[PDB]
Ligand binder design. Structure first.
Ligand SMILES: CCN(CC)c1cccc(NC(C)=O)c1
Ligand SMILES: [Mn+2]
Ligand SMILES: [Mn+2]
Lengths: 137, 137
């Protein structure tokens, strides 16, 4: 059967600024880069940045809610979020509707998130403060 | 410090067919559902389906190369691809790179992939046959 996420591939309009964002600003590990892409890791995540002439820099009001959240510890969350803010990283959401999260945009407008907590912890929190109509299986 | 992918959220235009696709067709575990979304898991992956009226059913020619690959064993790959084909799931690309890959679309046109092989395997192949302009770190 399916066992998890093998890799996440993001189309990027300019490879070097995107590599710099994920490696320098977000601290991911750069393993290789070539004329049309790069491979990074973030813990167990394999991230591929793929240079795509079709990628548009997209304002958050023009894209749907599809987004990618990265795990961070409770101890590191606030200072990492504040550093992104001080660096001028654009945002896309303020209301914490799914726990402790910081919502920010990559250079092409990919919707990213810092989140503290696992699925199990989110289900437990939702039992006390459930989303409308929530059912648990 | 970021420690991995916390969750992947896909915006969906209709919750029921998306739940059917990820849970029943793709075999993911459904943990909870509410009026505007669902939580599933696939191995370590926490997947959220978020009902979003701004989600367009998007032909693959009209979206960029951003895509989400799920892990599957080599032994299971062909029968899972055949299952998707029997279900009439559209393919958006043929495989031309190392490791088995099946490129398929979700009901809203999210670009998905079944892939066999790790980042370490890809890097080993690339070291032997580097892409144009490839540098390793
Ligand atoms: C994406 C462009 N920006 C400005 C937000 C950028 C890129 C790489 C690194 C840093 N800043 C630090 C401190 O790493 C900032
Ligand atoms: Mn999220
Ligand atoms: Mn891929």
């Amino acid at each position: 059967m399916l066992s998890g996420l093998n890799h996440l591939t993001l189309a990027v309009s300019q490879l070097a600024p995107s590599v710099a964002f994920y490696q320098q600003l977000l601290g991911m590990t750069l393993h290789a880069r070539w004329d049309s892409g790069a491979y990074l890791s973030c813990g167990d995540l394999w991230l591929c940045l793929s240079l795509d002439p079709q990628r548009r820099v997209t304002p958050p009001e023009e894209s749907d809610y599809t987004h990618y959240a990265f795990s961070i510890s409770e101890a590191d969350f606030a200072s990492f979020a504040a550093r992104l803010e001080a660096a001028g990283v654009a945002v896309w959401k303020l209301n914490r509707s799914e726990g402790a999260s910081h919502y920010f945009l990559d250079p092409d407008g990919h919707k990213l998130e810092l989140h503290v907590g696992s699925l199990a912890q989110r289900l437990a929190a939702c039992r006390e403060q459930p989303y409308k109509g929530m059912v648990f299986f």
